[PDB]
Amino acid sequence: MSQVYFDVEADGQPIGRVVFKLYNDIVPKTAENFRALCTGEKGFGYAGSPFHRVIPDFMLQGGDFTAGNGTGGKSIYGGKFPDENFKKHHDRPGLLSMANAGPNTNGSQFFITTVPCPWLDGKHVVFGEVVDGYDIVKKVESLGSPSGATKARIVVAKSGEL
Amino acid sequence: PSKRVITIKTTIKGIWKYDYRQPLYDLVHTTNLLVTHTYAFTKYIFLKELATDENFAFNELITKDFFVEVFLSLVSAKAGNSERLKDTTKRYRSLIGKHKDAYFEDAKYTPISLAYAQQIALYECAKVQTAYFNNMKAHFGNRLRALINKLFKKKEKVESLTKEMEANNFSIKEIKQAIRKNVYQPCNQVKLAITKKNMPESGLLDDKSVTQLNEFFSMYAVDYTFQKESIFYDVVANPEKHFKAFYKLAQLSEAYEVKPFACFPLRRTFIPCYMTVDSKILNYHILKNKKVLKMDEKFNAWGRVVNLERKAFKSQGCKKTLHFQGTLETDGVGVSILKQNTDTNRKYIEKLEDAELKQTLGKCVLMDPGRRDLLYCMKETSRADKKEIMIFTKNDRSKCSRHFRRLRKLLQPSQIREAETYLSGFATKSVNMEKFVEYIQARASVKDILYEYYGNETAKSITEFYPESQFDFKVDQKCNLYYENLFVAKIRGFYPQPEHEPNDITLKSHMYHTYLQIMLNQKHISERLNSEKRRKIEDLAKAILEQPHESGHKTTISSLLGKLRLLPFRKMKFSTKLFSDNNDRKLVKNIKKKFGADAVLVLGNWSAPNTKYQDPTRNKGLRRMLKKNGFPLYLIDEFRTSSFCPKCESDLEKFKVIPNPRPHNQEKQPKVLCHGLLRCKNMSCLEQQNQRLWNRDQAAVLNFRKILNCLRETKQRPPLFS
DNA sequence: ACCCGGGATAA
DNA sequence: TGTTTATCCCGGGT
RNA sequence: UCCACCAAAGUUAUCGCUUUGGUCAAUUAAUGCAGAGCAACAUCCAGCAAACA
Ligand SMILES: [Zn+2]
């Protein structure tokens, strides 16, 4: 079970660290893709990817490392890969899942849930959960707005694997 | 070695340096104007003399020199050397000046000042002459035939005979036989007599029609005769002797109300047209130079404007013998770069023998060229339980064309559509002098707006084509962001959303602001907005955050961005060309994939009864492409290959009536008999385990396979299909 | 006076 | 159907 | 003058037919593709609103 960590800065001020534990056994492909993107060994990664979308009480989103506005991003396996499975559900806060434009359109963008989202079950792939830094997650969420625009610029200053 | 030329397509955005972009826009936008007049004015002259005296010998005037003089007369310049003027040049200039003032008054045209225009007229005018010749060759003979059909009153006689035989209750076979013999054989005799410059047999044509033939023949010389006893071949061989004859034929056709056709070519399109930008033209017009440019300095001068290090400009071809000679063509958006290897200084499968036919065993693929479906391909090894079939439809190849047509029609402003409707109300192909003058006046009235609308890519734009227009960002079901119709991007991570519940308008305004920010970051959108407009839009976006509810900022932003809806028509044409090339490549790839590289192509001819002459079917074009890709191709007779059932060779008949799918014909014919579905008249098929149904193309390919097998086994076409 | 356009012609 | 490049004279400006 | 493509079934080699599943760069973008070599472009015009069975 791979564990990854992010160090986040808002307007150049560090705010904390968030640690995610992935479901490598149940969701191997998505977890491997996320780990590879975090490491950046292949040549691209989440390093410097802004949190272009944060809806308070709903979600945080990120992983756009080519446009920084939600239009970019690409997985290690290519532009798109089929949905793996839906054996996990958005039942608790802090669950990490892949953002997509529809069925079988998963890329490199990801989002973190802040409240139960039963309606998202069966349409998005969940492959990990937050194990530490949930307070940092709430701090980041507080900077968002319902429209998704953030009150201040927030970027993933550093990313890595433990 | 023989001279050959190749062309490379490119865009001005990639090869042309910015500093020298604006002058080119000034050049092309001017040339395309003058050239247009160079047509119309010429026709004007040909209508003022002929309308006054048909004896005027305008045949000599159909030459490049006359068109060059006409083009020059439209350009204002300092007086030249009158001593060196040739007598022919003097006569041409006097003839032009006889009507110059009248034409300028009618067209409301003013001489455009353009120095060094002589080097330009030599190119464009060279094309003008080409328009006069080819057009005639493309339309004379056929149109002549049409006139004969009207002279013989073919349609009226056919209708009368049809009514008489319906009264007599004759069957379809009897009616068709009676027509094809009684009504056609005399028509064929008359056509042959006219072809061999001989008056037709008396009694087959009335006086009002014999007079037309006599008048038409009076145009030619007494001793002149058609080469190879064929007027149709003579026109192509010696077009110079048919210009007056072609004009008289057009006059007669207009008198008899035949389908309009343009006797004198005219440039009607308002979009800028491609022009050849020679090294001299580049030196004197684009570079704004004022001294001679020799061949040695030609490449140096060219390099100052375009990047010769690009992939397109470098040598190409086997042994890279083709070199760029500083000559290209462009219309302000697209560029055709020409390369040459020389200096600029001045068979039916049924007719194949055994040794040839028997080499394709297991390699033949039978292709039916359907009228709607461009190709229906079936491999001879195909089985009923294992289908090996491919279909290439005309709709697929025209997808981009239809999409661009829809975009053009939906985005057409009210003023533009009204102007086009007004202009179309005046006949253009008619040779009548008064109607031509009316058309010239209408075009002069509407040009001020039409050229501005269609020149938006390069020319200045000041008219508000979309006044009081409100545009709001929208997302389709596939997560593509559109402004009103422009494509911004695809937000591939947009699907995750909560329950919307539009509690507040401020959230919607913030979403609009986010969409605007995303749009402004696009490379293909930012370049279309000047610095002042971009700053104003940014200020409005900033103010929207302070006052999201107010719609004034959104209206102002929409007014500022309204320029984006102006379609880049030249870019659309370039995209259409690219799509056509890619579709041809896709067809070739699919043929090689689903049938393999060993496929041998057999193509049909027509569904009409048997013919034994030219019959210029459109398929003649497609065959050119396939052979260029390395596919062997052969022809097979098709006139009777769709009338018998492959299973038992019995007669096939259409049986299902369905609503007409063609919208323009539904009202005139709500229901029509299906053409692509057939059934065998024999009922024993049910015993084999109703009648046996077939697709037209499937039956045709099966019959082609049977014919191929018969040829292989006995070396003779089946008697049934003969 | 002496050189620089710009049109016209020609292969 | 087509894919240009030189030479000559004189009116004007310095 | 509207109609992107592939496959299963009504269905028998079944249609501008019907019910499903799969395919996508969307485009007012780019000269196109392969994986550094290849590729005819432009004016007029026939397109279809049928000019020759
Ligand atoms: Zn049968």
Author numbering:
A (entry chain C): 1 to 162
B (entry chain P): 103 to 448, 465 to 807, 812 to 844
Show sentences the authors wrote.
pmcFanzor (Fz) is a eukaryotic programmable ωRNA-guided endonuclease 1,2. To explore this diversity at the structural and functional level, we resolved the cryo-EM structures of three Fz1 proteins from different species spanning two kingdoms of eukaryotes: Guillardia theta (GtFz1) (algae), Spizellomyces punctatus (SpuFz1) (fungus), and Parasitella parasitica (PpFz1) (mycoparasite). The overall structures of the three Fz1 proteins show notable similarities, all featuring a bilobed architecture and accommodating the ωRNA and target DNA in comparable ways, consistent with TnpB structures 8,9.
A notable exception is PpFz1, which features an insertion of approximately 100 amino acids within its RuvC domain, which we refer to as the Fanzor RuvC Insertion (FRI) domain. Multiple conformational states of PpFz1 were also obtained; four states were identified, with the guide/DNA heteroduplex 3-bp long in State I, 8-bp long in State II, 15-bp long in both State III and State IV. The ωRNA guide segment (C50-C58) encircles the lid and contacts the REC domain, which differs from the guide conformation observed in GtFz1 in its inactive state (binary complex).
